[PDB]
């Protein structure tokens, strides 16, 4: 396949928590904040897959690993800046109440550049939270998107099997100074929610981000005292072997 306790938070669609890859290791929190529905993938397909990459028992990057699911995307994979902010806030609250140390948050979503989203991310980074987001799939400058455009959030673009920018529909991975690193984001094998022993291949900057989150989680097991800047210098160096 070509591609010390840490806690990984996922903000995404609902997830199929029973799936064989993630059952018993993925705590479904009860946070849910989603807009009303505005076509062929299931209502929990995006998040089940990403929980899979990252932490899946046999297909995952951090085969462990401890995960907590917050719901910020509806069946059509559509959320809101505001719902995302409240989810981020839910995470901060549980950081303060029930620590622990090392905390990773996966944000496999993007909207247009948002001052307030970027701010919440900044505030959460100051508390020592590792934020990992997609650069977005628009063959565009990532600086135009949020959370992709936030420095202090780790922004991940997608490469394919030959280490080239991933092509998506008539679009593809975002690029530019706002992208902190690239990671595998083409045909990534992980849990399908079609059935609880099904696996699906998916492409996008979500996948690349999920991969970086998994590696960040393992590094933080081995050395739970890395500073964000240390973690980032390590991830950059890790994504190299050329």
């Amino acid at each position: 396949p070509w591609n010390s306790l840490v806690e990984v938070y996922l903000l995404d669609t609902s997830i199929q928590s029973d799936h064989r890859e993630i059952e018993g290791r993925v705590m479904v929190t009860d946070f849910e904040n989603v807009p009303e529905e505005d076509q062929a993938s299931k209502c929990d397909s995006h998040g089940t897959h990403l929980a899979g990459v990252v932490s899946g028992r046999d297909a995952g990057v951090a085969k462990g690993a401890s995960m907590r699911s917050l719901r910020v995307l509806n069946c059509q994979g559509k959320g809101t800046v505001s719902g995302t902010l409240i989810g981020l806030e839910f995470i901060r609250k549980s950081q303060l109440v029930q620590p622990v140390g090392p905390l990773v948050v996966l944000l496999p979503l993007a909207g247009g550049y948002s001052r307030v989203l970027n701010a919440a991310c900044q505030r959460l980074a100051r508390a020592g939270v590792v934020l990992v987001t997609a650069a977005g799939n628009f063959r565009d400058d990532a600086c135009l998107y949020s959370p992709a455009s936030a420095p202090e959030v780790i922004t991940v673009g997608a490469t394919n099997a030959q280490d080239q920018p991933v092509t998506l529909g008539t679009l593809g991975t975002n690029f530019g100074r706002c992208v902190d690193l690239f990671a595998p984001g083409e045909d990534i094998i992980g849990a399908s929610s079609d059935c609880s022993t099904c696996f699906v291949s998916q492409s996008g900057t979500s996948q690349a981000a999920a991969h970086v989150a998994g590696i960040a989680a393992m590094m933080l097991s081995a050395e739970p005292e890395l500073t964000l800047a240390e973690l980032r210098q390590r991830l950059i160096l890790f994504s190299a072997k050329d």
Partner: antibody
Amino acid sequence: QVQLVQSGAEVKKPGSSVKVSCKASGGTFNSHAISWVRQAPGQGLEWMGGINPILGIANYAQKFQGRVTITADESTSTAYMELSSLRSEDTAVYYCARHYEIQIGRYGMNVYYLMYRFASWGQGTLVTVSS
Amino acid sequence: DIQMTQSPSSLSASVGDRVTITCRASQGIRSALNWYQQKPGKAPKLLIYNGSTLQSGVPSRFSGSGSGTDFTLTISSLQPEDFAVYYCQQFDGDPTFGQGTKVEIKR
């Protein structure tokens, strides 16, 4: 005349490892998804894992994670099951059985369904663990 | 994983009997249940998959029924070679088996 033929009986001292093979034979294709399912004497059936050559990964049973590795020799239509840190309790007949990786993707996608329908076994291999 | 409870452990019957074994899942599995027959010293043999459909070349006296959580295997008119152990297994899943039912000769 399509069949799965396993390696022979083993005896192992506690704390060592066993490697049992399962060779596929007599069809046009013989590279298959293979499961291992054990039965201690007088007891019932217990799935250990499977190798899925299309998906390119194994799936291990939670009770055996860390003790079983399951591989396949790409040249010889043969799948292996290696169990280590043997203990008396591991004394059992070990069966291989074929399961399927069905392409159920639309549009597509690219969805591999692992369907555990054990139509074809596997004659069994007795592994005895004793000091 | 998912647990399967099979009932009863043991059965006595005569050729011509209608026998029913019953099998129960710890949660809903639609109809992702398989039935096997096992005779002494042999590998199990697939009889019924997906609750109710017959495996290739298996006699129609065998039938399966059930959905959700409670399942049934019925042998409608028992033959001398139907005396054996029967197992249910779910494949919803990460496969998991019932602890068996022995069909023995009445006398």
